[PDB]
Amino acid sequence: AALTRNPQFQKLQQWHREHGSELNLRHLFDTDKERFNHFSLTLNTNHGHILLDYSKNLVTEEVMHMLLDLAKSRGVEAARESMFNGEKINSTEDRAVLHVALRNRSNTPIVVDGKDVMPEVNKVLDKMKAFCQRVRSGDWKGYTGKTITDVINIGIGGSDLGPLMVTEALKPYSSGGPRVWFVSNIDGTHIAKTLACLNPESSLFIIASKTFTTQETITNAKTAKDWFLLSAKDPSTVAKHFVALSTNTAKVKEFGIDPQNMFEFWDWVGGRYSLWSAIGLSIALHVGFDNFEQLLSGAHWMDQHFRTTPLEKNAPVLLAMLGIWYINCFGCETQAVLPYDQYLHRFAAYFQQGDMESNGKYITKSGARVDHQTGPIVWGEPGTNGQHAFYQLIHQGTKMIPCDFLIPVQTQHPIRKGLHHKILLANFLAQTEALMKGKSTEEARKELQAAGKSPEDLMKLLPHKVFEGNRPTNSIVFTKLTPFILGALIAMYEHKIFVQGVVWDINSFDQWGVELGKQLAKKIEPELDGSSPVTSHDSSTNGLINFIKQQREAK
Amino acid sequence: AALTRNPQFQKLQQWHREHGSELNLRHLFDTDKERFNHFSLTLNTNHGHILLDYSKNLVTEEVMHMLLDLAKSRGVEAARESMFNGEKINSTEDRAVLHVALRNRSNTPIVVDGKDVMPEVNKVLDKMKAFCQRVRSGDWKGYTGKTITDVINIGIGGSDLGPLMVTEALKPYSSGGPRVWFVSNIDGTHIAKTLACLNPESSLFIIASKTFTTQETITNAKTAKDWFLLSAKDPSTVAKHFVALSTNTAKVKEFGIDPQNMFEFWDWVGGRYSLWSAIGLSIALHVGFDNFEQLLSGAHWMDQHFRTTPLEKNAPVLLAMLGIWYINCFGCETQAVLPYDQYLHRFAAYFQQGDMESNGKYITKSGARVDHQTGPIVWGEPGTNGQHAFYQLIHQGTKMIPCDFLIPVQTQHPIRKGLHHKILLANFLAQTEALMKGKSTEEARKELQAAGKSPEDLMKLLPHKVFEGNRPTNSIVFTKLTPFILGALIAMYEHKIFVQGVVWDINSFDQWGVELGKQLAKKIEPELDGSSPVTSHDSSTNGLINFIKQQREAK
Numbered sequence A, B: 001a002a003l004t005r006n007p008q009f010q011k012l013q014q015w016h017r018e019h020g021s022e023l024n025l026r027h028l029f030d031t032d033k034e035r036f037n038h039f040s041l042t043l044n045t046n047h048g049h050i051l052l053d054y055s056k057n058l059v060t061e062e063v064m065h066m067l068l069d070l071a072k073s074r075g076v077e078a079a080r081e082s083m084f085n086g087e088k089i090n091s092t093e094d095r096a097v098l099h100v101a102l103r104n105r106s107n108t109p110i111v112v113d114g115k116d117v118m119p120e121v122n123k124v125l126d127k128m129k130a131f132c133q134r135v136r137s138g139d140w141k142g143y144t145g146k147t148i149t150d151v152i153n154i155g156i157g158g159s160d161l162g163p164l165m166v167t168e169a170l171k172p173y174s175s176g177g178p179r180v181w182f183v184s185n186i187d188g189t190h191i192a193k194t195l196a197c198l199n200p201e202s203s204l205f206i207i208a209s210k211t212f213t214t215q216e217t218i219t220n221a222k223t224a225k226d227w228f229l230l231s232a233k234d235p236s237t238v239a240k241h242f243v244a245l246s247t248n249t250a251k252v253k254e255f256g257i258d259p260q261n262m263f264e265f266w267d268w269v270g271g272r273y274s275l276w277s278a279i280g281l282s283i284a285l286h287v288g289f290d291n292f293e294q295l296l297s298g299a300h301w302m303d304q305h306f307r308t309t310p311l312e313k314n315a316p317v318l319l320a321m322l323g324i325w326y327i328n329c330f331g332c333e334t335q336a337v338l339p340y341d342q343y344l345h346r347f348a349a350y351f352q353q354g355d356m357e358s359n360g361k362y363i364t365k366s367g368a369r370v371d372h373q374t375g376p377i378v379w380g381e382p383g384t385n386g387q388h389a390f391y392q393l394i395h396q397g398t399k400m401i402p403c404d405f406l407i408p409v410q411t412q413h414p415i416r417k418g419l420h421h422k423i424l425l426a427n428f429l430a431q432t433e434a435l436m437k438g439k440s441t442e443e444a445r446k447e448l449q450a451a452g453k454s455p456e457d458l459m460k461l462l463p464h465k466v467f468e469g470n471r472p473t474n475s476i477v478f479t480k481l482t483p484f485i486l487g488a489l490i491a492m493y494e495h496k497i498f499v500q501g502v503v504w505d506i507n508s509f510d511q512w513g514v515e516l517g518k519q520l521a522k523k524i525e526p527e528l529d530g531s532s533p534v535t536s537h538d539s540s541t542n543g544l545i546n547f548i549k550q551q552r553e554a555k
């Protein structure tokens, strides 16, 4: 154990056990005209403003204080410093965790084993811009001799979600770039439906893989190459249509891609924190290197913000401690992410991986068995669509669900003189208001009175029209969703995730929970061949396998 | 509350911990050769097989019995009958709940107020086929004489998710049909990015809206019409490019649509159960009416299975009671849906709406305050992608998470001689095996011994490589994902949702938790105009609104 030993954690727990049930959001606001002023923070980045209103939360100044003492007591600051200074904090793998280095525009040296990392970081960044240029506008080589129209990124998990999410989110900066596609699933339908719309001679493939050994990626990659080599019969033309993002040059050249067309990153770059490195080649190819370097800066801005701001006003820290409050004290299993922005329709999913992959652990750094909750289940859907799909359970269900509502002040498409975005903003505002205020039995009763329902009817409907409210939310508004702000927003959460992991004393940059599936998978592959029944596994796995062999032939 | 007061419910609850012997999947399979045979059911639909393996669950024959007695004790069967017989079980709105009627291929009369519903159901179905055939054949032309290339459905929530999900899932049956798009969000970026790729004279718009008054839909509709009327200056040409699916003739005749271009459905058709009615026009337009009827037939099939199979072998019932077990006894907040199939990438989200908006209630039919958990938070992502994004927390996190793994035996794209689907199946099988088996401390150590780790390495690494397993899953395998099976699969869950709702004694066909947001929304819309600060709300809403007006025109 660890966290459960800490005194500040104990005090925070005892306080909740005793005064937690009385905390009312509706109450708080009427007895404190400054609640908003006291529980929010506006951030000027010089490239847009970011307001983080965390006032619609079940917290008092005393609560925020206990929460802050806890963050300090757990060594959040020292841990932060260890990360930025290049120390190997990813203990289990004895690696450094340096995604802040990939976006370190200041170029302040960061040393890993007596060698500053920035030179190799900028070396790669430069090479990306150089390649980007040659592709973006003619000049790059289609064995046929034509400029490349489509870029296909082939990768999974960390080598996929980030580039995809960011590219969908920054479409308004598509500007003269080629069309980018993203193939990840091993499921053959994925690459097949992508290759069906492509033209070999004008397509550029980017096999994105850190280890360059993942089964889904390499298989998808081999299928792309066989597809390409089908039209272009010369295996030497592969170097004109295939490039790679990885660390194992040996593996890369084995595939057929030459060493100079391999953009590299480093072991200290976690997969779920890789979009900022070479893995973001498709982003740069889509919105140009300027919009990319912009993305790189917004994070860097946040990186510095996180580093230099006292805890009481540190966004990532505040976001993280609020989560701990709801996770370790209230016991809430999930964290809802709701961006009222279509372009960000992949944002929530980006962080399911971001959060869950990092903090879905039960073993601390000392090897002690955790005896408290860790990472939450992160889910969500955008725009106003959720209001019609599942808000019903958020408002009147039986689960307490912390919600982060995000939205840009001005859209990329102010059509109809801004009427759409006006309605979008109103709902964004109204939902957290409703989630907080709710609607009492009397307010409801009074409404049914003015409706003309018979005492019979009114009673049978009254409680159903009652909103108990008191449902906590965070409102995150920013001037506009540009590459810089987006980069800032992503970094913000990355650090939220970091702070929680440090508080739980767990290694957020670990993915050991994935190897059991992979190995039992490799063991089953050959058993699927043939039609003889399998019996080596548990009855269920046997049954599933045999039902499969039986039905594989049916029509 | 008619549930916590139920005897069989209390027995089940006391049993859950009245004694140890605490369930452990690995132990139950180790000691019961008959587990798979005893806890699974294969369904032959004559149009493909559907195996539901629910053996990887924390349950014994005694548990399944107690769970079954409970379902009977809460009148699941009588409730079912009342639904099918057309009784107004949606009490709060005094409406019938008849989505089974929309797919009632047998045409067995269903009477609602002394009038059989089927005639009006088939009347509409026929009209859809008539319209569908005209647009696809090229008979229906824009007032330019050009055939129609793209179909744009404009709707939200129930008038959107179903058609979108099914259309993505049945792409292999696209066959000759137009390109179909789906605009829902009020967020202007959504329709704008869609209209930018369209050509007025060849585009057909389908304004899908039950009430035909929802703000997002009507606004998006008005924007489409203004966009169209931009190229085509004649307001009378609207009847050649706009059609409607509604129950509100008056408003439909107000927008500018033609009465005979209105395909109707009925108040007893819930929005989140509407894809089977006229709302599925875009599905029929995409895959033809034949496939559409195979879709309905599939559901009609599951309906009959639900209606005629004793509880002990009734899939929807077994799926529902397992959930109750994990929801009301173990206390699990979420239900994960994982389809190893790219085409079904919108499946989880569909039921995220179907489940959550149906059972996210806290008021029973008697008006009593629920004192037990209700509907779970439903989330999920497809293929093997999840294995790389969040399975880490499912395997080694601290949350118990019931998981439904779904997959077709044979794919629509057996490329590379079926190698991709082979790997896909192996992972599908291996994951539930791993989730069940896990890896003990000794097995793990025995691995680090083999690998040749140092006495230090193995030490600090041992715990982290341990999988405690015992994580329950359901495996749902089907011969192939065809319109019929898909239709069968959707119906199956619809009824699982029905059974749980009946057990909790709540009205699953209600959406009252929606109004508060809408009204507070309307109240804020006009306050956003102008630059004067708003002060009528709580400090937070005021702050958010004012930060907005402030940043509204910054550059």
Ligand SMILES: O=C(O)[C@H](O)[C@@H](O)[C@H](O)[C@H](O)COP(=O)(O)O
Pocket: A155, A156, A157, A158, A159, A208, A209, A210, A211, A212, A213, A214, A270, A271, A272, A353, A357, A511, B388, B389
């Ligand atoms: O880092 C992560 O979040 C996960 O480990 C995973 O998402 C990983 O990135 C890929 O499964 C492996 O792909 P690569 O071999 O390209 O790293």
Ligand SMILES: O=C(O)[C@H](O)[C@@H](O)[C@H](O)[C@H](O)COP(=O)(O)O
Pocket: A388, A389, B155, B156, B157, B158, B159, B208, B209, B210, B211, B212, B213, B214, B217, B270, B271, B272, B273, B357, B511
């Ligand atoms: O059943 C539901 O889930 C709700 O009714 C919701 O999904 C509804 O479909 C939309 O809010 C649009 O409603 P209209 O179709 O009437 O415009």
